[PDB]
Every structure is written in C-alpha cells, then in structure tokens.
Amino acid sequence: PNITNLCPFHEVFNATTFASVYAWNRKRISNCVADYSVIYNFAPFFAFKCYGVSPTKLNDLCFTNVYADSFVIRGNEVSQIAPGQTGNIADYNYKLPDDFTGCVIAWNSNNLDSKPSGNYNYLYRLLRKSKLKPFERDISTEIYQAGNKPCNGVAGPNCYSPLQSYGFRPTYGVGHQPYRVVVLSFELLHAPATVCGPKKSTN
Amino acid sequence: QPGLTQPPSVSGAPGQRVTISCTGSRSNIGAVYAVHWYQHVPGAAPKLLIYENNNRPSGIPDRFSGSKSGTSASLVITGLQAEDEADYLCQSYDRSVGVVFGGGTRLTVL
Amino acid sequence: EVQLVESGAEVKNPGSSVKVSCKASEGTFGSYPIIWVRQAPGQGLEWVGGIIPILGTVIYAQKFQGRVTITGDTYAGSAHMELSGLRSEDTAVFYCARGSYDYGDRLLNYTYYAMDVWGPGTTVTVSS
Ligand SMILES: *[C@@H]1O[C@H](CO)[C@@H](O[C@@H]2O[C@H](CO)[C@@H](O)[C@H](O)[C@H]2NC(C)=O)[C@H](O)[C@H]1NC(C)=O
Ligand SMILES: *[C@@H]1O[C@H](CO)[C@@H](O)[C@H](O)[C@H]1NC(C)=O
Numbered sequence: 001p002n003i004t005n006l007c008p009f010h011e012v013f014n015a016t017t018f019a020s021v022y023a024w025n026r027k028r029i030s031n032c033v034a035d036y037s038v039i040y041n042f043a044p045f046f047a048f049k050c051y052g053v054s055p056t057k058l059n060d061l062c063f064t065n066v067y068a069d070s071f072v073i074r075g076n077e078v079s080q081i082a083p084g085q086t087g088n089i090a091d092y093n094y095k096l097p098d099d100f101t102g103c104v105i106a107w108n109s110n111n112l113d114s115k116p117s118g119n120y121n122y123l124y125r126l127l128r129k130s131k132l133k134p135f136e137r138d139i140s141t142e143i144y145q146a147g148n149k150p151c152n153g154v155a156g157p158n159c160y161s162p163l164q165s166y167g168f169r170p171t172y173g174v175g176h177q178p179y180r181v182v183v184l185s186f187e188l189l190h191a192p193a194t195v196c197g198p199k200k201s202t203n
Numbered sequence: 204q205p206g207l208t209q210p211p212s213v214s215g216a217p218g219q220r221v222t223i224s225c226t227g228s229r230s231n232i233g234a235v236y237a238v239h240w241y242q243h244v245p246g247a248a249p250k251l252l253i254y255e256n257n258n259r260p261s262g263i264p265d266r267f268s269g270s271k272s273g274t275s276a277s278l279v280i281t282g283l284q285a286e287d288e289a290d291y292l293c294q295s296y297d298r299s300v301g302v303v304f305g306g307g308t309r310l311t312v313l
Numbered sequence: 314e315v316q317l318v319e320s321g322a323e324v325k326n327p328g329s330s331v332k333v334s335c336k337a338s339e340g341t342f343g344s345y346p347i348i349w350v351r352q353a354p355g356q357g358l359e360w361v362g363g364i365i366p367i368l369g370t371v372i373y374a375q376k377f378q379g380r381v382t383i384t385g386d387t388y389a390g391s392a393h394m395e396l397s398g399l400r401s402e403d404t405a406v407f408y409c410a411r412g413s414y415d416y417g418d419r420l421l422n423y424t425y426y427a428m429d430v431w432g433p434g435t436t437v438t439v440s441s
Contacts, residue, residue: 074343088416118388126344126367127417146421158421160368164344167388173339206357239427248408248431255426292358296425301374304358 003198005032009039012068016112018180020122021071021093022163023139029066031194035059045107046179047078052101052186059197066195067102067185069094072113072122074166076175078106081183092125094183097134102185110170110177119168122178127162205231207238207293207305215312218282223308225293226275231303236296238276240269243290243307253278285312314338315345317409317432325399326440332395333435335409340389342366344415348428349383349394352406363424366390372424399439406434 007029019025036058053061073081073089080090084098113119127144143151144162151159168178209224225238232238240253251260256271269278280287290307297303318336325331335347346365350358364371366385373381377396385392396403413429414420 074341092416126415126420144417146417158370160370162417164367167341167343169340169389171389172341176339176341176343204357204359237425248433250431251427251429294358300376301372302360302424304360306357 001199001201001203003033003035007032007034007195009034009036009068012070012182013039013042015070018070018072020166021073021089021124023137024069024071024094026137027068029068030064031192033198034063034066034195035198039105043107045105046075047104047106049082050103051083053103055103058103062193062197063186063195064189064191064193065187067187068182069185070180070182072109072166072178072180073124075108075177075179078179078181081106081181088126089124091131092128093132095132095134095136096183100185101187102183104181104183106179106181108177109180110172113178113180114168114170114172116170120165122166122168123163124166125162126164127160204304205297205299206303207232207295209293209305209308211306212309212311215283215285215288215310217312218284220279220281221283221310222277222279223291223310224275224277225305227295227303229274231297231299232271232276232295233274234298236298238271239294240267240278241292241294243292245290249290249292280310283312288312315411315430317411317430319407319409319432319435322435323437324440325438327400329399330395330397331399331437332393333407333437334391334393335432336391342385342387342390342392344387344420345411345413346415346420346423347383347385347392348410348412348424349381350408350410352408352434354405360424361396362394364392365420365423366392368421370421396437399437401439401441404436404438406436408432408434 077089080087081104083096083100141163143155143159145151145159147158155161207225207227237256241249242252243249252267253269266281288311291310292307293305295303316338320333323331344367349362350360360374361377362373362381362383364383364385366387371383380398381396383394408431410428410431412423
C-alpha cells in the first residue's frame with residue numbers, strides 16, 4: 001500500500017522543450033511502477049492510438065522494458081507515426097517496424113512553440129539516398145549530392161543541406177502548427193519484469 | 204504547341220464505357236516519362252484524376268481509369284453521367300522542352 | 314485542406330509587365346513547391362515556371378526564359394511571379410499549383426509527377 005516506484009513520466013512529458021524530429025531522444029524506463037493514469041491528466045489529445053495492447057487495461061498489463069520517444073511534428077503529418085505508413089516523416093526521420101507494439105500519444109502545443117516572428121528550432125530531414133531500417137536515427141548532416149558533379153564538401157547548385165527547418169508561427173492554422181508527439185514502445189522477453197501496476201489494496 | 208494531340212471531343216451517351224486518347228512521341232513520353240490526367244471545369248480550377256500512368260488518387264470513385272501502351276496512352280470512364288461534362292487533359296515531361304500538355308477534350312453528353 | 318488565394322484581374326497595355334501572387338492558406342508552403350501555368354484563350358495549357366521555395370532552386374520554360382521571374386517566401390509564403398513584355402498573345406489566365414510530394418527523392422526531380430491542388434486563376438489582359 002506504499003507505492004514508491006512511480007515511474008518518472010512527469011519528466012518525459014512537460015519537458016518544456018521537445019527536441020526536433022531529425023534527432024529524437026530515446027529514454028529507457030524499467031524497474032519501477034508505471035501508473036499510466038497520470039498520463040491522462042493533460043490536454044485533450046489529437047491522437048491516442050494503441051496498437052498492441054488494449055489501452056484501458058494499461059495498469060495491470062506488465063512489461064520488461066519500455067521506451068519513451070518524443071518529438072515535434074507538423075500537424076497534418078501526425079498520422080504518419082503509425083506502423084506501415086509511408087511518407088516523409090515516417091521514411092526519413094522515424095520508422096516504426098510493422099510488428100510494432102506500444103501506444104502513441106499526440107497532443108497540440110500551438111501556444112508553446114511559436115513566436116510572432118517565427119521559430120526555426122525544429123529541423124527535419126528532407127533528402128537522403130535511401131529509407132531507414134526500423135528504429136534507427138541519422139543525426140549526421142552530409143551535404144546531399146544530387147547532380148552528377150560532387151558538392152566539394154559544402155552546399156552548391158543542386159547540392160543542399162538535407163535538413164530543413166520548420167516555420168512555426170502563432171498565426172498558422174490548425175494542421176500546420178507543432179503537435180508534440182510521444183511514442184511508448186513495449187517489449188516482453190525472459191528478464192525481470194518488475195513493470196506492473198500499483199496494487200489496489202486496503203490498509 | 205508540340206503537345207499531346209488527341210481528338211477534339213466525343214459526345215456522351217448515358218451510362219457507358221468511353222475511351223479517350225493521348226498520342227505523343229517516344230522521345231517525350233515513350234522513353235521513361237509518365238503521363239498525367241486532369242479534369243478541368245471551364246472557368247474554375249482543374250482537378251487531378253490520374254498520376255504515374257496507372258495509379259488512382261483517393262476521392263475519385265472507380266468510374267475513372269486509364270493506362271498507357273507503346274507510344275501513346277489513354278483514359279476511360281465507366282458509367283457516363285452529365286456531371287462529367289468537362290474538359291479533360293493529359294500532360295507529361297519533354298526531353299525536348301520541359302513539360303508538355305495536351306489539347307484537352309470537351310467531354311459532352313446529349 | 315489547402316487553398317490558393319490569388320489576386321484579381323489585370324488590365325494593361327502591350328510591352329508592359331504584370332506581377333501576381335499565389336496566396337496560400339495558413340501560410341506554410343512547407344516544402345510543397347509551386348508551378349506557374351498559363352491558360353491561353355481558346356487553347357490548351359502551357360507550363361511556364363517552377364519554384365521549389367525552401368530550396369530556392371527555380372526553373373523556367375525555354376519559351377519565356379528571361380521574360381518571367383518568380384519569387385516565394387514559404388513562411389506565410391505568397392510566392393510572386395511577374396511576366397514582362399505583355400503583348401496581344403499574352404492575354405490569358407494564370408494558375409498556380411502544388412506538387413504534393415515534399416521530400417528529396419522526387420522534389421529535385423519535381424517537375425515530373427503531379428500537381429495536386431490548384432487555384433481559381435487570374436485573368437491578365439492587354440489593351441488593344
Ligand atoms: C530524376 O530521376 C531520374 C531517374 O528517376 C534520374 O536520371 C537517371 O538516374 C539514374 C540513377 O542511377 C542515373 O544512373 C542516370 O544516369 C540518370 N539519367 C538517365 C538519363 O537515366 C535523374 O538524375 C533525376 N534528376 C535529378 C536532378 O536527380
Ligand atoms: C510542468 O512542471 C512545472 C513545474 O512543476 C509546472 O509548473 C507546470 O504546471 C507543469 N506543466 C503542466 C502542463 O502542468
């Protein structure tokens with residue numbers, strides 16, 4: 001009745017600065033008690049889609065390791081964060097595996113990530129040579145080469161920085177404002193689980 | 204216009220399968236290039252119907268279709284209706300000069 | 314949804330120039346690049362200009378090469394295009410359209426595939 005390892009989630013959320021999506025973080029959580037109920041005490045969600053495990057029973061269902069990812073993406077691209085869904089932000093920056101498991105929180109932050117002149121502190125990948133194998137990151141910025149001539153180590157005609165910045169401003173309408181997205185990935189194997197819900201007991 | 208010539212217009216019987224042509228060179232379509240089918244409302248903004256020579260954009264019910272063959276391509280409507288009375292258009296790239304557009308056929312129904 | 318607001322009609326004399334915009338809703342072109350096409354009276358269509366606004370790499374049709382220039386903003390972007398030396402054979406309608414693919418595999422190959430959402434077009438007329 002003395003719940004003590006409330007898994008740290010008030011920090012995976014509310015961090016006040018989500019990193020851009022070209023280079024997403026990856027926080028591994030284990031060895032605590034994860035009462036996901038607190039998650040439902042933020043703003044109404046543009047998307048709460050759970051794919052492997054039914055969402056209401058998130059208390060009692062147990063785990064070995066959980067993985068928390070977070071980034072910021074243009075609104076009408078939220079749907080691209082779902083297994084086997086092609087498109088830019090899902091084939092160049094964050095590729096789910098089509099045997100994925102876990103849930104996908106996605107809420108709105110229009111008040112928190114715009115400036116009257118316009119933010120540019122979120123850059124996403126726009127060019128590469130081929131798509132990504134699932135669950136992989138490429139923070140590197142090699143000046144992309146398009147034409148038959150080399151770029152000589154810098155940008156040039158038909159050789160441009162693969163990263164490109166968002167423009168976030170308060171005047172932008174719904175569907176092009178920054179939605180903050182977080183993805184919880186699950187997995188089960190032969191290891192000390194120790195990831196279960198809080199016992200409902202009586203003193 | 205070194206464009207994509209096709210016959211000017213075809214009258215419309217009600218509710219059938221009608222085909223429309225788009226003929227060009229091998230040097231501007233045949234080599235690797237793709238054709239593209241637009242629907243145009245006279246006086247308004249046109250609409251896409253077919254891209255990548257074969258695929259079918261969402262929001263378009265299966266009435267429309269089309270394909271390519273050798274040195275030409277074509278489009279087809281099943282179940283003709285009066286709302287389809289409009290301009291039709293086919294476009295592609297051009298090794299010769301950038302992008303090339305066809306005449307547009309004024310599909311009419313009587 | 315995406316809407317492409319654009320200015321009203323233009324009336325002027327031979328040899329002059331006209332500048333018209335392609336006002337886009339909610340302002341973020343967001344790497345969706347813009348194609349500028351003419352509607353000749355009683356005739357088909359002719360592509361004129363093409364601009365990928367974030368990268369800023371711009372191409373023009375050989376017929377009007379050096380006769381027309383295009384610019385764009387892409388953040389509350391309202392990409393502008395102006396045609397110079399208007400004459401009798403230039404009175405037409407102006408359309409601007411997107412490409413809807415916005416990533417490198419086919420956006421530097423841009424002018425191949427498609428143009429998704431178009432605009433009402435604006436009439437430009439020579440005086441004669
Ligand atoms: C546009 O795409 C085409 C093909 O989709 C590119 O043309 C060929 O690309 C292959 C790729 O390996 C090359 O081996 C060929 O030499 C290219 N040319 C031809 C005639 O086949 C073309 O490079 C692309 N354009 C840009 C600007 O990247
Ligand atoms: C985030 O944490 C700070 C510090 O406690 C708090 O002031 C703020 O209210 C939290 N965010 C929300 C949405 O409650």
